[PDB]
Amino acid sequence: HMASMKKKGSVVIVGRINLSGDTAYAQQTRGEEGCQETSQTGRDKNQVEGEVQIVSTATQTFLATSINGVLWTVYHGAGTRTIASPKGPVTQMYTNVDKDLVGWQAPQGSRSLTPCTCGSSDLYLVTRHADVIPVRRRGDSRGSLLSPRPISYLKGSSGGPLLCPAGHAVGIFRAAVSTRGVAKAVDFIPVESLETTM
Ligand SMILES: COc1ccc2nc(C)c(O[C@@H]3C[C@H]4C(=O)N[C@]5(C(=O)NS(=O)(=O)C6(C)CC6)C[C@H]5/C=C\CCCCC[C@H](NC(=O)OC5CC(F)(F)C5)C(=O)N4C3)nc2c1
Ligand SMILES: [Zn+2]
């Protein structure tokens, strides 16, 4: 019935990948209970830091990456959802289901990566567990893992960054190419698609 139709909650920042120092490690900033509450209200007073956020809905968890003042993530994680923020839910600034890409204004306190201009093919994928995985670029939107891994190790890292040697954003992790459950290559949204959308 119309009176009973419910609302999907907002995406919620529940942690971050710390790349500040010499060692990368994940930090959680909100537990499940607070996450559920924050997703319903859309009101998130937590301080935000860093470039790579860990984000969750009521049913999924993935990553979000700030590039040039926009917090980017994948449509198959976020859908058309708002993101929780100190002033309430924030509507998506970008939505492209054809690229599996969405974006919101980057939260106050976040740091943005700058798009890569090096043209280098030696990349590094950052996972939700703060693993930094060497990836060789194989195409506009493909890269091969130098050391293959079960897909289990990549699950939940969509929306994370592929970086160049200089630490620039090369793309947003979108999908894993696997055979027999072993991930051999990754599919990603090139940063140029982002720069075009912007
Ligand atoms: C509904 O609207 C839309 C619109 C456009 C969409 N466009 C894409 C490409 C897509 O793909 C889905 C989701 C994605 C995925 O699971 N992404 C990662 C992830 O972690 N998600 S996640 O965080 O856990 C989660 C669900 C958000 C919470 C990183 C991968 C890690 C492990 C996956 C293993 C099993 C899956 C292997 C699979 N493989 C593959 O499809 O490869 C091919 C794409 C190609 F290049 F053509 C070849 C794969 O990767 N996906 C399947 N859904 C779309 C949906
Ligand atoms: Zn670069």
**How do beta strands 142-150 and 182-190 pair?**
antiparallel
Tokens of 186: 């990754």
Architecture in CATH for domain 2-105: Beta Barrel (2.40)
Cβ-based burial of 86 (10 A; exposed 0-12, middle 13-18, buried ≥19): middle
Task: Give the length of the chain.
Answer: 198
* Residue 75, helix vs strand vs coil: helix
Q: Do domains 2-105 and 122-197 have the same CATH topology?
A: yes
Which ligand is located closest to the Cα atom of residue 166? 2
Please state whether beta strands 61-67 and 70-74 pair in parallel, antiparallel, or not at all (unpaired).
antiparallel
Locate the domains of the chain by residue range.
2-105, 122-197
Q: In what order do the strands lie in the sheet with 101-105?
A: 25-28, 12-18, 52-56, 61-67, 70-74, 101-105, 94-96
The response to whether residue 177 sits with its C-beta less than 6 Å from ligand 1 reads yes
Q: Is 185 in the pocket of ligand 1 (CB under 6 A)?
A: no
Dig out the tokens for 116 from the structure. 């890569």
- Indicate the DSSP class of residue 153: G
Give CA–CA dist 163/69, Å, rounded: 17
Name the residue at shortest CA distance from atom 53 of ligand 1.
76
**Which positions make up the binding site for Zn(2+)?**
116, 118, 164, 168
The experimental resolution of this structure, in angstroms, equals: 2.1
CB count within 10 Å of CB 90 equals 19
Say which CATH superfamily domain 122-197 falls into: Trypsin-like serine proteases (2.40.10.10)
R_g (Cα) of the chain, nearest Å: 16
For the record, the structure tokens of 190 come out as 């090139």
Experimental method: X-ray
State how far the Cα of 38 lies from the Cα of 193, in Å rounded to an integer: 31
Which structure tokens are listed for 180? 């027999």
